[PDB]
Amino acid sequence: KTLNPKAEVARAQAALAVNISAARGLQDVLRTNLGPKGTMKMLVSGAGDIKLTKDGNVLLHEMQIQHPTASLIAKVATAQDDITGDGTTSNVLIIGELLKQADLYISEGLHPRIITEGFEAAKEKALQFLEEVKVSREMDRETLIDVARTSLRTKVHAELADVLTEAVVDSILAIKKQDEPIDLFMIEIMEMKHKSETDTSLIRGLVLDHGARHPDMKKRVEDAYILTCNVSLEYEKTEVNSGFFYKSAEEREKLVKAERKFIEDRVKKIIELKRKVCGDSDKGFVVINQKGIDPFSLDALSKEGIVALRRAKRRNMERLTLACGGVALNSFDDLSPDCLGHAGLVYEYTLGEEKFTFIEKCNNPRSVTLLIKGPNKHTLTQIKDAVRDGLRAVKNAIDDGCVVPGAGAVEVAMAEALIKHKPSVKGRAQLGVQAFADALLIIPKVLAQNSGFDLQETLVKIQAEHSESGQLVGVDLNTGEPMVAAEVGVWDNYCVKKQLLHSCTVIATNILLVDEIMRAGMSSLKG
Amino acid sequence: KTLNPKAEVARAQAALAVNISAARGLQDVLRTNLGPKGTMKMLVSGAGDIKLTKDGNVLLHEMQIQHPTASLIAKVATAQDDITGDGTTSNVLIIGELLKQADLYISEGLHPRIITEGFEAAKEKALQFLEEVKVSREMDRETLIDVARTSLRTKVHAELADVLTEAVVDSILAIKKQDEPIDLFMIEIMEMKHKSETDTSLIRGLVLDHGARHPDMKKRVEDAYILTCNVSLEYEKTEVNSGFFYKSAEEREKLVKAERKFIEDRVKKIIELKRKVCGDSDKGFVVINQKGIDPFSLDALSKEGIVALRRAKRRNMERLTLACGGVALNSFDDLSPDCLGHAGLVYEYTLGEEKFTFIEKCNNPRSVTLLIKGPNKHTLTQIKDAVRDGLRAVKNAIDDGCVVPGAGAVEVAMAEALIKHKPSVKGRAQLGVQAFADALLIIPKVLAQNSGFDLQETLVKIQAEHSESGQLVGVDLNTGEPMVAAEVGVWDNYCVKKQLLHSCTVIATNILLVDEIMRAGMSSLKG
Amino acid sequence: ALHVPKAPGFAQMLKEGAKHFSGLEEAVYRNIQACKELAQTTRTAYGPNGMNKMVINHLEKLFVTNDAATILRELEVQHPAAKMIVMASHMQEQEVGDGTNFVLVFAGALLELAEELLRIGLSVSEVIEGYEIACRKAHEILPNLVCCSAKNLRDIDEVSSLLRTSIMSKQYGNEVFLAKLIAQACVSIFPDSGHFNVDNIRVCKILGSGISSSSVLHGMVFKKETEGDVTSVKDAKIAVYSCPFDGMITETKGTVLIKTAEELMNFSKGEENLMDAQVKAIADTGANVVVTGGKVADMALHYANKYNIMLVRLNSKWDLRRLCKTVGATALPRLTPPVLEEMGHCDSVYLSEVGDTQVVVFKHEKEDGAISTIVLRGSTDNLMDDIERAVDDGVNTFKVLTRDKRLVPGGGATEIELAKQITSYGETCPGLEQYAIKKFAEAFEAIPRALAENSGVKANEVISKLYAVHQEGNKNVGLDIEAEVPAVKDMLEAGILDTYLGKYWAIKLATNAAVTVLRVDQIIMAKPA
Ligand SMILES: Nc1ncnc2c1ncn2[C@@H]1O[C@H](COP(=O)(O)OP(=O)(O)O)[C@@H](O)[C@H]1O
Ligand SMILES: Nc1ncnc2c1ncn2[C@@H]1O[C@H](COP(=O)(O)OP(=O)(O)O)[C@@H](O)[C@H]1O
Ligand SMILES: Nc1ncnc2c1ncn2[C@@H]1O[C@H](COP(=O)(O)OP(=O)(O)O)[C@@H](O)[C@H]1O
Ligand SMILES: [Mg+2]
Numbered sequence A, B: 001k002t003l004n005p006k007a008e009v010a011r012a013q014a015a016l017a018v019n020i021s022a023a024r025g026l027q028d029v030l031r032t033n034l035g036p037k038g039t040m041k042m043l044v045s046g047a048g049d050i051k052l053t054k055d056g057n058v059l060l061h062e063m064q065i066q067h068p069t070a071s072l073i074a075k076v077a078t079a080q081d082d083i084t085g086d087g088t089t090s091n092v093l094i095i096g097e098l099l100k101q102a103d104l105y106i107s108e109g110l111h112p113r114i115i116t117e118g119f120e121a122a123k124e125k126a127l128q129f130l131e132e133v134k135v136s137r138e139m140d141r142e143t144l145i146d147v148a149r150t151s152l153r154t155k156v157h158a159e160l161a162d163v164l165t166e167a168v169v170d171s172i173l174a175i176k177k178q179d180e181p182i183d184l185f186m187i188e189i190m191e192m193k194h195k196s197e198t199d200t201s202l203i204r205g206l207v208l209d210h211g212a213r214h215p216d217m218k219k220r221v222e223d224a225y226i227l228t229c230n231v232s233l234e235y236e237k238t239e240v241n242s243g244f245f246y247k248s249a250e251e252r253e254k255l256v257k258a259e260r261k262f263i264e265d266r267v268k269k270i271i272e273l274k275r276k277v278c279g280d281s282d283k284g285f286v287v288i289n290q291k292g293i294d295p296f297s298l299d300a301l302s303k304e305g306i307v308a309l310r311r312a313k314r315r316n317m318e319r320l321t322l323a324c325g326g327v328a329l330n331s332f333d334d335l336s337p338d339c340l341g342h343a344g345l346v347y348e349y350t351l352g353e354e355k356f357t358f359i360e361k362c363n364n365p366r367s368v369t370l371l372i373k374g375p376n377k378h379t380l381t382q383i384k385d386a387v388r389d390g391l392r393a394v395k396n397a398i399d400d401g402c403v404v405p406g407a408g409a410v411e412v413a414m415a416e417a418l419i420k421h422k423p424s425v426k427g428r429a430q431l432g433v434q435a436f437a438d439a440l441l442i443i444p445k446v447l448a449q450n451s452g453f454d455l456q457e458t459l460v461k462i463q464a465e466h467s468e469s470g471q472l473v474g475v476d477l478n479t480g481e482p483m484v485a486a487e488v489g490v491w492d493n494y495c496v497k498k499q500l501l502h503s504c505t506v507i508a509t510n511i512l513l514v515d516e517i518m519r520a521g522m523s524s525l526k527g
Numbered sequence C: 001a002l003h004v005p006k007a008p009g010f011a012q013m014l015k016e017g018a019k020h021f022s023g024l025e026e027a028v029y030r031n032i033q034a035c036k037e038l039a040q041t042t043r044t045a046y047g048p049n050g051m052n053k054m055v056i057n058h059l060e061k062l063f064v065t066n067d068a069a070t071i072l073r074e075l076e077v078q079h080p081a082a083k084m085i086v087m088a089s090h091m092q093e094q095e096v097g098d099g100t101n102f103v104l105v106f107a108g109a110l111l112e113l114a115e116e117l118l119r120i121g122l123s124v125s126e127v128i129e130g131y132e133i134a135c136r137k138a139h140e141i142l143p144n145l146v147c148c149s150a151k152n153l154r155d156i157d158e159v160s161s162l163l164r165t166s167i168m169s170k171q172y173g174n175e176v177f178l179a180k181l182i183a184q185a186c187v188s189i190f191p192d193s194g195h196f197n198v199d200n201i202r203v204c205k206i207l208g209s210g211i212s213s214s215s216v217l218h219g220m221v222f223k224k225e226t227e228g229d230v231t232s233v234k235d236a237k238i239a240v241y242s243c244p245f246d247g248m249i250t251e252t253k254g255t256v257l258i259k260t261a262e263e264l265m266n267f268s269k270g271e272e273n274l275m276d277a278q279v280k281a282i283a284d285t286g287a288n289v290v291v292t293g294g295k296v297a298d299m300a301l302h303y304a305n306k307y308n309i310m311l312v313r314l315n316s317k318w319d320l321r322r323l324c325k326t327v328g329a330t331a332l333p334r335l336t337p338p339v340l341e342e343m344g345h346c347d348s349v350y351l352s353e354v355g356d357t358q359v360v361v362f363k364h365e366k367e368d369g370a371i372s373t374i375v376l377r378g379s380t381d382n383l384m385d386d387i388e389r390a391v392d393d394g395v396n397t398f399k400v401l402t403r404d405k406r407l408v409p410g411g412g413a414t415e416i417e418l419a420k421q422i423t424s425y426g427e428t429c430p431g432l433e434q435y436a437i438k439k440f441a442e443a444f445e446a447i448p449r450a451l452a453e454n455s456g457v458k459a460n461e462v463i464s465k466l467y468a469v470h471q472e473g474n475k476n477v478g479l480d481i482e483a484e485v486p487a488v489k490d491m492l493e494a495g496i497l498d499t500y501l502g503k504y505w506a507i508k509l510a511t512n513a514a515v516t517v518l519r520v521d522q523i524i525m526a527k528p529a
């Protein structure tokens, strides 16, 4: 204040109160999205774009809040989202509950170091319990189906959820190999604004966003070959600056006829290769080019019955090679017939102004394409986000050799273990262990509040049913009665929960140790 | 809100959060004025006045806070102060703790009606316990001395506190009666600006703020008589507009003497009365008038050695009548010598521009006068406020036929009684009873925090000592060891604590039943 | 960028325009720094070798004084930490009248020596207790260092030798003449059985020659003129009248009623006859000069000049009472002839002029009398004001000496001896109060250091030599002034004596201000109006 009069600095109590208020606000705001019985939010940008999503990360990024703690929470949520998959709202909920439980004991007159030590001990105990309670499975087709259904149940209704689950399972089984990790960047997500959303199916092949350009071309071929290349077929100029010099009109015409001979050689080579491969009027030939094609080459290809596609993406070079089985060559050196692909049905579709290209009927494809349909843009975005979340959950369940039951029995078991473990710890860490155990029980409280039942009575009944038994008694969302979680079909993940707990502990340790938010920067008010 | 766009309004959760934040902010500030180990405050007004006080009622008004809840709290504190006396800081602390304990259980899925119903039963049980836990004594001099010392210990240091306690006890015993209640408005509070040491004693008599006007009057008068009157002695005009109509200078002189003969007759009557009362020259005559005196009467009375005063207040006449025992007559009709007072030593003191008169040495005085002495104005105001608080505490202890030990043993006993009576209440009022029992333990916590020791361990030790032996084990402020409050000499009040608890319950009931703050008033802005 | 909000509790409801300083760094340390900055201002003007200061207030005036009281009064400080010291100095000046800069220096030194204790770890309670114990010890040892008392109070060859030390500290150079004048003025007004008043000395500023041309006057003076033509009066019989020298009328509004011509012709004649009769009856008692206190008339003035009656008109509601108390007369509210016991016998009443200013001198040939008047001569108003302030300080010192005839060795030996005794007593004091006692003992060395800084010598060597002299055996040895070499000199043989009760009250008020400043925790202010 004495050195910089235009600087705002806060002490320890003020900064702690501000952080606690921000955490409580972020917890109360993102609390109606936990569980499938939650509410749907509507976000409108500055340009007038309606977005109907249910993810916690998108809702936190599109909420218009300027705060350092809120920015850190948003960054942590984005990191969790793009590292694991599903676990954004629960992260903020547990962080806020832990901060509230810590402030409840700090305001009475305690030290943050003992609270941090107790939180670390409780996190270690919970990690040990989760590592000793996880059950091993073989992950068959029914397990992945149930996992995808449980992951997609909190997005749409029942029919769309099951359709997306089946589509994701089929795509994963199609892109499944015998070894090596599951490589992504293979399932193309194409959105079409026609028909309804109930007509979502999986296409065993690749769906392009552009079709042919020449009107005198074939539209439906029963049997054709796939040629993947990226050579240039346009009038390319030399690197060094050159110039033509003629004398009369005959020399000019000769130079014009001779300057278009480089692409003519490639056209003749392609024609000869097609005539050697096919021969009669029984098979077709599709040319997939990444660059543009001159109109002369297009007409020359259409004169023989060749459907060529120009201007393609770089990601389609690997998907076509993995699906059909061709060779993505760059030059026309060793043009062998074995470097081609096999097709089954090459037909296009017109949707007003845009054009599509569907490649179906394949032998053994390895990169499928999910077709998404929606009447609106927000619905398409929500379906795409749900499909991405389901794919991430399936990948996380496949990469791990264990399964964790959902509902809230794991949190109750962790709280019981922490309650049974606090008397074994010395010092003042018992209060921290109790706070960590009470903060972990916020998932069933929110799950029971959004359904329409009580909270304290439900928690008491769950604890009474779990203490007298030895099974994972979950929390039901239909009648409120305590039921089994690892018996109906509710599942979750292990690494995702571990990363969530680690991030929560790191955030709690970073917040409980910061008590000075000094701002001594340049205002930049010159001119 | 749609009818008036320029009007702010809060909902159910927003108004509750605002009220809770305001209560917490008001509690976190007044938490440093509990017990004699508190910190002093320095208030600076807009003009440049410095005030050094430690009371909570003055701090709640000199804090410059614009808030409805803060205004209500300040009004309740002022009402408690000017109705009973000492009981504002503890009242605000208990109100804040109760509001915090109620908000802790409100944000969990409960209705404030159950909390109010539980608080009602808790207050009833606390009143039933206080009606039997009080101790009745004979109320001798030692009990009043100890009560005044305990009330004044949290104001100044030690020697000044004992001096003020002795002065208050002496004044109370002097104004004490056997049939009439303790009447106030009798002890004059005179301030001085010299001798800030051991000089704030008690004066057996009366000290005025005005002396003699004629320089020829006597300064120190021995045995004299006191004459209390309020008749006018100036040139009083008639009610009807009149006028003189003289002819020459002789008629003018005659009319001048005629209008003065009316006062000359009264002067001669007073002279004759003084001559009949005295006779020789070993006695004097003091005249106390309430109105002004013309210089002619002052010069006429100075020839006989009369020290008369002019321009006095209304309470001074009553104080003189109660001390000396004369008759405060209004007219000079039946001027009998029996309507006079008796004095002993009357001397005029001069302090620069001001002038005072000391009327001491009386037969049986009933109205004393406390002579306050201080170095500056803030110290004088602080000593005056401390004397007023001590007098109020002594009056409250005398008017009641019972005593209550101070410290924090009463709160611990009430909390233990509420805990023992907690499972004996049906319904969901157990949470409210627990919250009320935990909210009453804020006084020992604040006392231990201000003393310089632990809080949780000290409270646990106090509870263990109270449960292991049924005694009034208080909380020490020097070593932190469990000591007996009734053995040292710490005493409080019963009616004051009852009124404090009633006000706290009323404030809690009025706050917990309000969840809407609307401001739809007129702006009163035209332009 | 990112902006931080406010604290949801008390900072939001703090209201704009006000301030809050709850921490010890932004409150106690700020007050200590403010007090140190205030003490560093009036530090060079303490001893006799200190320079003066020219302060100008907002009234476009001129005040070139040397006392710290006038400087603190003409400063307008907007800080409570310095306002407390200003109030303490004002209280000390009102009580004694010669101990403001000393109190300020003591408070500043105490705060500076307690700031380091609070920084290293000593709390406010232990520091306050140690300071109170040290103050009690100093007040107990103080009466043990007298060894000097005043004999007679009416001797002119003894009073001027006591106030010379106090006069030299305020007016260096010309002090013997001022001391002699003050002693003569105090002797000429000294009554009996004690009871010395401070309002019995009147100061008159007349722009004349130099300072040596001033003298004393056994009586009173007034800067007015004579209404009549009578000037030189030998045996003057003063008859003071509080009523205005005019015809008395009625208080109630009343007019005169005339009908016939006889009344209209005889009214003025009868009025003039009554006026002449009253004038003749007033002058028949033997009065030679009439001093009125109101409006005069033309006919009354003419009748007084016809019978050779001097008329003096003045209105001040205080000078009339002073003249009545001096000449021994009473005021009459009517135009009645006075009695023999209500006459004002004087010696010589004339009208002269000095320095181009007509003044009425009421010189009396009596050695005793009542009050006196000191006439000042100079060429600048600032010098006359400084001389008047020095005369007032000398009168206050004489009053203090009359109230208490106990003397203490001045200069700087008393403070050194007190510090040595406190250090020797605090050595056997266990606990944590020994540090506070040693710090309080170190605060007494600020007076000799300031004296050496104002004189122009090394303070450390002077302090070391004084400590060595005090440890050798001598106790009444201070610091020499008329020597450029830092040496020592005896204070009892020279005559550097100051009051004891004044210094005791100054130390008490300084300790009170110090503990009051230390007792302040947090600061809560509002917005200026
Ligand atoms: N059908 C269901 N039955 C029981 N519990 C469920 C069901 N669907 C979701 N849940 C619970 O709701 C919680 C929130 O899930 P969700 O919002 O989909 O993702 P996140 O766990 O990242 O918030 C999960 O912890 C899960 O245990
Ligand atoms: N010397 C003491 N010993 C024990 N308890 C004390 C002492 N002085 C004050 N207290 C306690 O501190 C509490 C606060 O007292 P105080 O702040 O003076 O007035 P108020 O009770 O109005 O806040 C009282 O309830 C009293 O029991
Ligand atoms: N002749 C002298 N020699 C040395 N010191 C002197 C002399 N006269 C005065 N002093 C010092 O001046 C101090 C007082 O100076 P002054 O500012 O006039 O009064 P105050 O006591 O109000 O500060 C005394 O403490 C004394 O030690
Ligand atoms: Mg989810």
Ligand SMILES: [Mg+2]
Pocket: B086, B087, B151, B154
């Ligand atoms: Mg009290």
Ligand SMILES: [Mg+2]
Pocket: C098, C099, C166, C169, C170
């Ligand atoms: Mg001086």
